[PDB]
Write an enzyme that holds these catalytic residues in place. Structure first.
Site, PDB file in Angstrom:
ATOM      1  N   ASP A   1       0.847  -1.192   0.000  1.00 44.76           N
ATOM      2  CA  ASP A   1       0.000   0.000   0.000  1.00 44.76           C
ATOM      3  C   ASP A   1       0.887   1.248   0.000  1.00 44.76           C
ATOM      4  O   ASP A   1       1.482   1.597   1.029  1.00 44.76           O
ATOM      5  CB  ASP A   1      -0.912  -0.036   1.229  1.00 44.76           C
ATOM      6  CG  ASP A   1      -1.864   1.135   1.294  1.00 44.76           C
ATOM      7  OD1 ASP A   1      -2.942   1.039   0.664  1.00 44.76           O
ATOM      8  OD2 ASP A   1      -1.536   2.123   1.996  1.00 44.76           O
TER       9      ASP A   1
ATOM     10  N   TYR B   1       3.304  10.035   0.142  1.00 41.36           N
ATOM     11  CA  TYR B   1       4.379   9.541   0.994  1.00 41.36           C
ATOM     12  C   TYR B   1       5.744   9.971   0.487  1.00 41.36           C
ATOM     13  O   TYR B   1       6.723   9.877   1.236  1.00 41.36           O
ATOM     14  CB  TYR B   1       4.342   8.012   1.071  1.00 41.36           C
ATOM     15  CG  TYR B   1       3.080   7.366   1.629  1.00 41.36           C
ATOM     16  CD1 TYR B   1       2.095   8.109   2.297  1.00 41.36           C
ATOM     17  CD2 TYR B   1       2.866   6.005   1.456  1.00 41.36           C
ATOM     18  CE1 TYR B   1       0.943   7.499   2.787  1.00 41.36           C
ATOM     19  CE2 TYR B   1       1.711   5.387   1.931  1.00 41.36           C
ATOM     20  CZ  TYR B   1       0.756   6.141   2.594  1.00 41.36           C
ATOM     21  OH  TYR B   1      -0.391   5.534   3.060  1.00 41.36           O
TER      22      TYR B   1
ATOM     23  N   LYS C   1      -2.332   6.164  -4.308  1.00 42.44           N
ATOM     24  CA  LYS C   1      -3.400   7.079  -3.906  1.00 42.44           C
ATOM     25  C   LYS C   1      -3.137   8.453  -4.491  1.00 42.44           C
ATOM     26  O   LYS C   1      -1.988   8.902  -4.524  1.00 42.44           O
ATOM     27  CB  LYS C   1      -3.501   7.193  -2.372  1.00 42.44           C
ATOM     28  CG  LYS C   1      -3.425   5.853  -1.647  1.00 42.44           C
ATOM     29  CD  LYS C   1      -3.722   6.001  -0.149  1.00 42.44           C
ATOM     30  CE  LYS C   1      -3.503   4.655   0.553  1.00 42.44           C
ATOM     31  NZ  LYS C   1      -2.078   4.486   0.816  1.00 42.44           N
TER      32      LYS C   1
ATOM     33  N   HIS D   1      -7.081   9.743  -1.658  1.00 46.38           N
ATOM     34  CA  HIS D   1      -6.424   9.667  -0.347  1.00 46.38           C
ATOM     35  C   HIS D   1      -7.277  10.273   0.751  1.00 46.38           C
ATOM     36  O   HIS D   1      -7.292   9.756   1.865  1.00 46.38           O
ATOM     37  CB  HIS D   1      -5.055  10.357  -0.411  1.00 46.38           C
ATOM     38  CG  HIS D   1      -4.046   9.829   0.558  1.00 46.38           C
ATOM     39  ND1 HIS D   1      -2.705   9.738   0.241  1.00 46.38           N
ATOM     40  CD2 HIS D   1      -4.158   9.440   1.850  1.00 46.38           C
ATOM     41  CE1 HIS D   1      -2.034   9.290   1.289  1.00 46.38           C
ATOM     42  NE2 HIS D   1      -2.893   9.078   2.275  1.00 46.38           N
TER      43      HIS D   1
END
Lengths: 310, 303
Positions: free
Chosen positions: A43, A48, A77, A108
């Site tokens: 994931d 990030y 996402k 997200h």
């Protein structure tokens, strides 16, 4: 069996590795170790800021013969800053991950903020240092562009992240492609029974991020409440000869809610994947159901200057 | 300054009477007493099942010369079961209230449920005693029908009830008529500053239902901070709590039948809180939600 069938026919592993807050050498070792142990679900997310490193680790594993692309389930996402740029954000995620398709692509947050460039996601602030929340792109417009990533062949399955009952019902009511997955925080101290049940009623697989609540296996300071310290879970861990984390994860699996625990430590990676190898008895599930605290632990940074859960 | 200007230019009284859980003679007397004391804002709803009685009390007040229609600000709301029947529901509310127009019409919840008949609103349950939540009518479709009640001249101002930040941002992004009002629970134990500030940033007036908050039980009126400020200002704790919302541009609709309380609530307009005392109240937020749907729905919508 280790997978759950999504409403478009694809099988999704019910245990995945959450990659939030893994970086650099720790990220590389975690992904390689996880694939070696048997993880097949990873994931990731644009925001990030690790998609290139995630792609490099997966590429190493495939090139070393540890796994084949078609055996992996890879999620990313679209960030809040790209609610108006979904297709190009998706193409960018694919480029950074070195992939030709994603297995799952999620919105997200149910929140649009000021665009900061494709591939350079950000949470921009306004003149008053408050998150520059957009009021021009609807969640439905974003969702129909998520549907375009499917029709373009970029993405197999699409879904929601951090949407609750009102927003999920709204999505179901305007969707042409029903979401396959709705991912949100849920664990024994934030059980969200009504939301999980509602997703399942409508054929949406709910997925638990933060499935251990606040908890990590590190030595830490006082003042961090976590379901893994609950005497009920401690007693069940002794009964089943499992870790408290394994009990917490299996509890979500028992109700059809896949989990994406985060970890780099090989012993814990292994334990979390071995949740597949035992079952909780009915009465022990009902015991865990009694300890809900309705306690949200995964929050946006205070630097947004806005509590979106106000 | 007893009113606030909505973004379409209409004035709204910042103190209103909330009518939830008032019925029968208590309701009629409360409305007549409120009007005599000076109340001009009344918050009704189809699902309260009292619109006929509300309309009879307002008509009696106008007929006796206590007030004129143009001086009153009357709100009703479309129930969850009518999200696909908004114009029909609005005309039904107008018929029951004996009004030609509503000043404000709100979407009671950001939730559609199974239709139960126009004028017979209900929260229907499915086969397992769980709320029969609809997945065919979007909130945007409902909102554009709220806009149609304005286009038809049935309603002056439209708005939201029980919408939070994600849903309010979404409404602003698709609305052709930006909502004038967003009504939700907020009080000194559930201050919701980010949501209040977000509404105001975009020209939406946030409005506090349940403005006084909450065996045994819990209430901001029992907080030592409010008790101390009550003695400092020589006001009731309820007056302090109400004034705190007024000070941040958030109108209040306290519920009350007793003339002494009706009078005290309206006199919140006659004093001000000092900056430092507002800041004192800001420190006591507990993020404590007290106004919940019936447990008979079988679903926690705030899950």
């Amino acid at each position: 069996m280790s997978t759950i069938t999504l409403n478009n026919g694809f099988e999704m592993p019910v245990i995945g590795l959450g990659l939030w807050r893994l970086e650099k050498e720790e990220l590389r070792s975690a992904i390689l170790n996880a694939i070696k142990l048997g993880y097949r679900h990873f994931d990731a997310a644009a925001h990030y800021k690790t998609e290139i490193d995630v792609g490099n680790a997966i590429a190493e594993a495939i090139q070393s013969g540890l796994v084949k692309r078609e055996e992996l389930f890879i999620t990313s996402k679209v960030w809040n800053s790209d609610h108006g740029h979904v297709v190009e954000a998706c193409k960018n995620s694919l480029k950074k991950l070195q992939l030709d398709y994603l297995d799952l692509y999620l919105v997200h947050y149910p929140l649009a903020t000021k665009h900061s460039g494709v591939g350079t996601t950000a949470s921009l602030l306004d003149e008053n240092k408050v998150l520059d929340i957009d009021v021009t792109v609807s969640l439905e417009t974003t969702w129909h562009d998520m549907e375009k990533t499917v029709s373009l062949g970029l993405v197999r399955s699409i879904g929601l992240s951090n949407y609750e009952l009102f927003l999920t019902r709204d999505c179901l009511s305007y969707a042409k492609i029903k979401p396959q997955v709705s991912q949100f925080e849920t664990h024994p101290y934030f059980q969200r029974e009504s939301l999980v049940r509602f997703c399942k009623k409508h054929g949406v697989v709910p997925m638990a991020h933060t499935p251990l609540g606040g908890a990590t296996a590190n030595v830490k300071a006082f003042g961090s409440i976590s379901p893994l310290e609950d005497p009920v879970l401690i007693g069940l861990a002794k009964k089943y000869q499992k870790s408290v984390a394994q009990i917490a994860l299996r509890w979500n699996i028992e109700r059809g809610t896949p989990v994406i625990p985060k970890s780099s430590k090989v012993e814990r990676l292994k334990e979390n994947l071995e949740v597949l190898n035992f079952k909780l008895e009915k009465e022990d599930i009902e015991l865990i159901n009694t300890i809900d605290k309705k306690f949200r632990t995964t929050l946006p940074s205070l630097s947004w200057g806005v509590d979106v859960y106000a």
